[PDB]
Design a protein around this ligand. Structure first.
Ligand code: W84
Lengths: 59, 255, 59, 273, 40, 255, 57, 40
């Protein structure tokens, strides 16, 4: 509800099976993407095309 | 810095990475290949959907607990409903395929347990009734659910006794079939590449399953103290070099 | 965000499940990053919705 | 080049004038296949029927209007025409529209000319000299709320400033997302049960915003903007049947109900001249 | 002489002088010769 | 002894013979071909089911009677349910295809009547409401049934007025589109080969139809005396050079 | 210029998609490292993202 | 053609067409090869 270091953290629960960790659409100019450097630059242009690289680092 | 240990398999639009592998087995030392003309009989040109069927389908997960007896899936049955692989299957008269099987089970350095992952070509099951009772169709076509060897005898179903491989042979000798162990202390996955093995060049995909994949706990699961007493096991399988032939109306099969 | 032009979804699920060692507890977190592949194209520059103002600033 | 060759009497087994139209072809029959002709030359190249020529002259595509007046106490500049805005499009006016829709896909650069003239319908001491500022507000970029918003800074968005009475001219490359602009589109933006049908969803070009830069004088001044568009570097594919009924909407093919017969009825018989 | 850097800014294009109506007037699969019978 | 008149088209596992053809049209003089790399954008390898999708599907038959106004089918819609073509369609994100269309109508040397068979690239329909009323999805996706121009206006559907091609242009000028006539006295079939025509290299097969096939009686059917007053018209269509790309979960579309 | 090369099935000991982000690098991974791709060309130069262009209006 | 004497008076510069992200994307001291293990 207010910007926090915690919205960068995707939590994981021990022992859950089959279940879903997170979900998002890919509107790179809006939503989660919007404040990232990528999101932030994309917004200076009208059209984009290309591949995106999404990585997850485990802690 | 390549280890036998880390691996990547990319097939179609899907990729698997394992950081704790124990090499991989290629049944009978042969890699899946298409059907050569010299071996062909049906005159029909075949259909090779390629990347739309040769990708990785992850079946629903199982739960290994201290009481587990083992699970059994049949191919191509297990995939009868996966994406376009399955459609092709019901729609052509004949089809043929090899597979990459990747069985996954991770734990920690305090757990113990060891699963046998084996592929048995032509695994004809036995009726628990004895005599010459048959094993009805539905029972040998469990689909993605597979057969749970610790489930109860049912009527018209197969016997589920593990020391006998569901056929009158001893568990101990299953090692003559292409197989790999998952020993929590070593291993976290098992990978087997299955070439197409049959006495005919191409066959029906619905009336005959050509391999059963079997995952059997052998050294019981032992979790660290006050750990939850169970681990999930996941099976992901990818058809490879698939060919379908004799297209038509779309088979209707029991149940 | 255009519909016709939309790009998909990204989801993540447990394949088997997270398992913590003994003497350990709670949630673990993943950090996630985004960057563009060398593939990428951006065109037709315009103004960003990400910054605005109501009076000129002064020193 | 010969327009007709010389040809004389014929009594053959080879009849070029009998064909089978069911085949879908238009067989290339000439005067000399059925009468006796004399040589004549063309003297002509077909220069002025080139599609570049056909779509290449400026056409009026839009007339809007804005006014310069005291905005003091105006709660909605947009609504007071303190600065209008136009949802760029090329089918709002019909002369050019019928011409473009002779083709299915069209690709071209645009040259815009913008003429602005002022009117002072009620008592003024004089005619003031106003500067117009037209901005390109592509989709995704802040759209102006007051006639003097931060938006007008237009630090990244092309804008032109010219004087009322004058003309502004600049040219924009082909900004389509695909390889050509669709003059027609028999689709939806997604498989929704209620989404709009047509090209409205495809021809997402964004809008263009006009305003006067001048503050207000004592009288009010009406400025009326006319946008002209000229296609340059034209490429057109797949000819279609010309538009017969009147148009009702930007971007749909719809015609009005109880329209009138478009084919002129004979005053007389089939036999009449 | 172009005074400007971008191609969109150049004047009108110059006559195709391409002209080939056969894609529209004779898109038949088997070629029809004028003078030969239409249907054999 | 070859005539323009007799023909055989074999495509996949299906063959058509006509003994009364009137040549065949190949739209814009181009024959269907796959998507070249130089024109490609999506990086995905595509799937080319070949003979399992490139065969002839015969849609259900229509009945030409003296009151008929004409029928309209959209592609790829009309085939949305045919065999594996259809499955592929719902299962990939993008697909591309050309077609061979064969329209059939035989009578006797005493009948008269003449149908126009035309293919219109990007046939955007008009709402009969006027103004800027849209034409809902379902209405422009009739499936194998196609649209019957002598059916009644419905709400959210297109206008079905024939002298206006369903879009504000005159029937008389449809001849600028690849087309062929079926004149009972000459002809008994019409065949048109359609190359893939779009402003993008590959597109969605469900949100956008790229051609409407239209069969319109123009010279009314006239049967011999005391003949039954009607003839069936059959449409058989075969996808050709089909490619699918971006496989996944399987689209869900309205209605 | 190719935007993507053609690439097919992989079953290797060489995994380009596993990295260690703690190092501070962004490893140059491409679509063709993890799916099967077809050749496609760029058709584009990145002209309008040059800093001269970005700050030049 | 420059009409003016000073360099500041010339038009915009022309595309770097330089482009080398490695100072930003791979400033590591020991070179990392894609495909080889990250940490040995
Ligand atoms: C200042 C200033 C103002 C501008 C405007 C930039 C031009 C953007 C417009 C792009 C061209 O717009 C269209 C819209 C529709 C069509 C079209 N619709 C179909 C009927 C056919 O073509 C073509 C171009 O640029 N600088």
């Amino acid at each position: 509800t207010k910007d926090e270091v915690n919205s960068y953290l995707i939590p994981l629960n021990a022992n859950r099976q089959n279940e879903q960790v997170f979900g998002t659409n890919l509107f790179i100019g809006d939503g989660v993407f919007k404040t990232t450097l990528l999101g932030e630059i994309v917004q200076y242009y009208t059209h984009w095309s290309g591949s995106l690289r999404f990585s997850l680092m485990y802690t | 810095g390549y280890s036998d240990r880390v691996q990547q398999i990319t097939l179609g639009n899907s990729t698997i990475t394992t950081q704790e592998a124990a090499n991989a087995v290629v049944c009978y030392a042969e890699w899946p290949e298409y059907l050569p003309d010299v071996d062909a009989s049906d005159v029909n040109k075949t259909s090779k959907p390629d990347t739309s069927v040769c990708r990785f389908y992850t079946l629903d997960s199982k739960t290994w607990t201290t009481g587990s007896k083992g699970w059994c899936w049949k191919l191509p049955d297990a995939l009868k409903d996966m994406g376009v692989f399955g459609q092709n299957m019901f729609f052509h008269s004949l089809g043929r395929s090899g597979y990459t099987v990747h069985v996954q089970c991770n734990a920690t350095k305090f757990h113990s347990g060891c699963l046998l992952v084996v592929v048995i070509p032509e695994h004809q099951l036995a009726s628990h009734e004895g005599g010459n009772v048959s094993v009805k169709y539905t029972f040998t076509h469990p689909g993605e659910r597979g057969i749970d060897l610790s489930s109860a005898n049912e009527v018209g179903g197969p016997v589920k006794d593990v020391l006998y491989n569901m056929n009158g042979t001893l568990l101990g000798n299953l090692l003559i079939f292409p197989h790999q162990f998952i020993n929590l202390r070593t291993n976290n996955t098992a990978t087997i590449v299955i070439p197409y093995i049959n006495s005919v060049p191409i066959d029906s995909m619905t009336r005959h399953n050509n391999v059963s994949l079997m995952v059997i706990p052998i050294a019981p699961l032992t979790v660290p103290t006050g750990a939850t007493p169970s681990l999930p096991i996941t099976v992901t399988i990818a058809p490879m070099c698939t060919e379908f032939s004799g297209i038509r109306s779309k088979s209707i099969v029991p149940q | 965000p255009d519909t016709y032009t939309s790009a998909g979804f990204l989801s993540c699920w447990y394949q088997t499940s997270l398992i913590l060692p003994p003497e350990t507890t709670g949630q673990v977190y993943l950090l996630s990053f985004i960057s563009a592949c060398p593939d990428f194209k951006l065109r037709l520059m315009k103004d960003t919705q990400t910054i605005s103002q109501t009076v000129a600033l002064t020193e | 080049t010969v327009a007709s060759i010389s040809s004389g009497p014929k009594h053959t087994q080879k009849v070029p004038i009998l064909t089978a139209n069911e085949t879908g072809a238009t067989m290339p029959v000439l005067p000399s296949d059925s009468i006796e002709t004399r040589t004549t030359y063309m003297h002509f190249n077909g220069s002025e029927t080139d599609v570049e020529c056909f779509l290449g002259r400026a056409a009026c595509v839009h007339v809007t209007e804005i006014q310069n007046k005291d905005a003091t106490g105006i709660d909605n500049h947009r609504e007071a025409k303190l600065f209008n805005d136009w949802k760029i499009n090329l089918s709002s006016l019909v002369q050019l529209r019928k011409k473009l829709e002779l083709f299915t896909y069209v690709r071209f650069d645009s040259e815009y000319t913008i003429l602005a003239t002022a009117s002072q319908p009620d008592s003024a001491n004089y005619s003031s000299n106003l500067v117009v500022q037209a901005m390109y507000v592509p989709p995704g970029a802040p759209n102006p709320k007051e006639w003097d918003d931060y938006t007008w800074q237009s630090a990244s968005n092309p804008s032109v400033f010219f004087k009322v009475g004058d003309t502004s001219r600049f040219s924009v490359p082909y900004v389509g997302l695909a390889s050509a602009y669709n003059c027609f589109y028999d689709g939806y933006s997604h498989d929704d049960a209620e989404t709009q049908y047509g090209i409205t969803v495809l021809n997402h070009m964004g809008g263009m915003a006009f305003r006067i830069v001048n503050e207000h004088d004592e009288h009010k001044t009406l400025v009326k903007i006319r946008v002209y568009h000229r296609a340059k570097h034209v490429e057109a594919w797949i000819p279609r049947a010309p538009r017969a009924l009147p148009y009702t909407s930007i971007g749909r093919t719809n015609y009005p109900k109880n329209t009138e017969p478009v084919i002129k009825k004979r005053k007389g018989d089939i036999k009449s001249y | 002489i172009n005074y400007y850097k971008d191609a969109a800014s150049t004047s009108s294009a110059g006559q195709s002088l391409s002209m080939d109506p056969s894609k529209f007037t004779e898109p038949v699969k088997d070629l029809m010769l004028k003078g030969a019978p239409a249907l054999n």
